[model samples]
Every structure is written in structure tokens, then in C-alpha cells.
Target: GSPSPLPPGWEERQDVLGRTYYVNHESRTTQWKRPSPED
Candidate 1:
């Protein structure tokens, strides 16, 4: 698993099932992937 802390202004969010993601407001980028079956 990646261990680096999120950079300043980065935010962490999760789903009801507890999946993790990181979002960046400045760059308008988000860490994401297709859900289980399609991905």
C-alpha cells in the first residue's frame, strides 16, 4: 500500500464499504477506479 501522507489541500474520502480515495481541489483531480466487476 502507498504510505505517503496526503499533500496540503488534499482531502481523503471514503465509501460506505470503506474504500479510500484522495481528491485535490487545486488540480481538480481525484483518485478513482471502476467498481469491482468492470474494473
Candidate 2:
């Protein structure tokens, strides 16, 4: 990953399994997909 910005309200965190995931604070959603530059 590059030193780019992620979407607003979305935060990155590590799971208990030591994996990265995304969660949207605005929508209360969770997914494993990385945000694209177009996001």
C-alpha cells in the first residue's frame, strides 16, 4: 500500500487473526476489500 488517503469515515484495523480490514463508520459496514484510489 502507498502513502495515500482512505475514504472519509473509514478506518483500518487489525483483527484477532492479524489481518487488515475496513469498516465504514458512516454506514456501519465492514468488508475486507481495500479502498481504491477512486473511492
Candidate 3:
């Protein structure tokens, strides 16, 4: 389950189903992983 509300269609990303389903367009937000420095 989603811990909080998503940005429009963030849940439909490829990481959730191996392929994009919502917007299906590769944008800047979906192209990088911003992990915490400690991780």
C-alpha cells in the first residue's frame, strides 16, 4: 500500500510492473534515484 499520496501518477511507474502504465513517458523525475547519502 502507498504510505502517502503520489504525484499525479507516480505509482504507475515501471518499477511497480516492469513497464510504465500511467503516463508512460520518461520524464526527469522518473529517470533517476535520489537515495539518502547514508544509504
lDDT of 1: 0.58
Clashing pairs in model 1? none
Clashes (N, CA, C under 3 Å) per candidate: 0, 0, 0
Q: Write the per-residue lDDT of candidate 2 for residues 1-39, one digit (tens) a residue.
A: 444367887777668997777887898778688766555
| lDDT values for all models | 0.58, 0.73, 0.38
TM-score of each: 0.44, 0.62, 0.20
Best by TM-score: 2
Residue range with the least summed lDDT across 10 consecutive positions in model 3: 30-39
Scanning candidate 1 in windows of ten residues, the lowest lDDT window is 30-39
lDDT of 2 at 27: 88
lDDT of 2: 0.73
Q: What ordering of candidates by TM-score runs from best to worst? A: 2, 1, 3
Model 2 off-target regions past 4 Å?
1-4, 37-39
Stretches off by above 4 angstroms in model 3 are 1-3, 12-39
Q: Is candidate 1 or candidate 3 better by TM-score?
A: 1
